[model samples]
Target: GVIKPDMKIKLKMEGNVNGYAFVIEGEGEGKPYDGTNTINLEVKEGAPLPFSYDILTTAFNRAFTKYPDDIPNYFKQSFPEGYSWERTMTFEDKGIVKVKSDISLEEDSFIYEIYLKGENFPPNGPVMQKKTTGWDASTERMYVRDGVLKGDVKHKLLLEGGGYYRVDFKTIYRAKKAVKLPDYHFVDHRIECLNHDKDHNKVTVYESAVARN
Candidate 1:
């Protein structure tokens, strides 16, 4: 796998909503989700949400990277159980686009929500716009088994946006197994009834671990 693996996600648009058309596609590279799973290292079930710094930042930037960036800025706030991050930018003179993402911790799993609203301005390719309220794309979940790592992230974006999409994306990533070397057996030179096949490369010297005295 390459250093920065990428995944693409496409959202469906059914006709027009509020007479505005939203974006149909989006994607992103892997970003660290908490420190432990950096680059999708697999998740440990015992770990709980520590309210990561990128929690909302990840969602906010994810919701709108295609839009113009005039030194793009976002604001974040914390309320007891979760975080709120939002950014608003003008869609020219016509109107404004407000995008917000929320991360709230629940009992067993946590909740991630995206909220977007545009007046006179829903971008032609808005994938995170769903009635402006926001929905649970996925509850951050993961599990490991048999030296393999398996995780679950229920969302809708192309790379990491939706409640669901193609390419299990980061949900099913595994670390490459390290290559192991072989260990050869040693033969004592004194007792050697040499076999012709005893090549120096395949066999070792008389200094064996348990050499017969």
Candidate 2:
């Protein structure tokens, strides 16, 4: 059974984007919140991850060793550079936030949460994504950060010079570890969003869905 909000979040906008709303919603299909999306640039299974895996392992040990419960400094100062870590998204020319940021655990693992916004990136909560240490498993996905601006659709504000559009949706990554061999694979996705004319009230923007299992 699919859940309503595995990923919880909230959103605020810059400029004249005051009150926001999820006019069109997923009836029992989905509900949402907002946050920045962290896309991990990890080494595929059977591939060598950066920082020698050993360093990655140590960093893991360090974090849990230090926090034992939660991570604030987290993986910071653990990575050298060049992908495979955490990075927040950057809005397109500053429109519908199309982003590709990552927070990798490489050999360890982590449940990275991003409450995406403009200044301070707004505020929201819960888990946005988790990495399987690239050991037992490895996962990846490309999604809009806290909103649906573009992708296989029409009326995408970003497509036609985005304005003050904010999307409040949910992004939950729950991929079963890549089983042994071809083992099994699947790609299930449902696409939908909204366009509320503030003439009534509210302005906010954009989900799952992934392409792996």
Candidate 3:
């Protein structure tokens, strides 16, 4: 297993529609639909539409990072039930490249792969490892491949104050800038963790990369 740091996402031409006042607030008023569609006006004034790919991509990442459980809340007001997102299509039009991703939630873990036509991105590397080396439950003292944990073994302990390791494979993607197609590249990041702890409440704090690797 190898420990490597890499980017996960790439953005191209992205701009949001502006000043295009449209009532998208959910209210089934205009259309004879079952669900209620509120009358809400959205003005794409200050910024442009199809916003920069970088901005949109970053926004997606931030939204996911900030709220892992609920992501659609940050984007549009509402989405159909059980709707998940996955990368669908990416195309270059005018100056900007439109990139779209589909979303979804799953219970079990799975592996996914994508192939690009023109550009060459990094391949999914090998799995890395992290583990617990030593620990003193009484004194709450533990040594891992990375560092030491000094805290209460019962309460203050994070990840059982033991060796925590991960074997991760690196992957990368690229997006061309609208203005600078080949020059200003937007990096898209992805990874395959060979192993990760299933328990969320239990924390595993590694002392160093050496201990984990």
Q: Pick the candidate with the highest lDDT.
A: 1
Q: Candidate 2 residues 9-98, lDDT tens each?
A: 221111111122111111111131121121212222222211111112101111111111121221233332212222222322232222
The best candidate by TM-score is 1
Candidate 1 structure quality by residue, lDDT tens digits, 1-213 = 211122222221111223443222112122211111111111122122121111111222121111122221111012123334444433222444455545443332223355444456334323223211122233323333443333333333232243322212132222222212112211111111122221111211111111111
- Write down the TM-score of every candidate: 0.24, 0.23, 0.17
- Give candidate 1's error at residue 193 in angstroms: 67
Q: Which regions of candidate 2 deviate over 4 angstroms?
A: 1-87, 92-114, 119-157, 161-191, 199-208
lDDT of 3 at 144: 21
Better of 2 and 3 by TM-score: 2
Minimum summed lDDT over a 10-residue window in model 2 is located at 125-134
Give a tens-digit lDDT track for model 3, residues 118-200.
11111221100111222212111112211211111221111224432221111122211111111111112221111223321
TM-score of 1: 0.24
lDDT of 2 at 118: 24
Off by over 4 Å in 1: 1-80, 106-110, 122-213
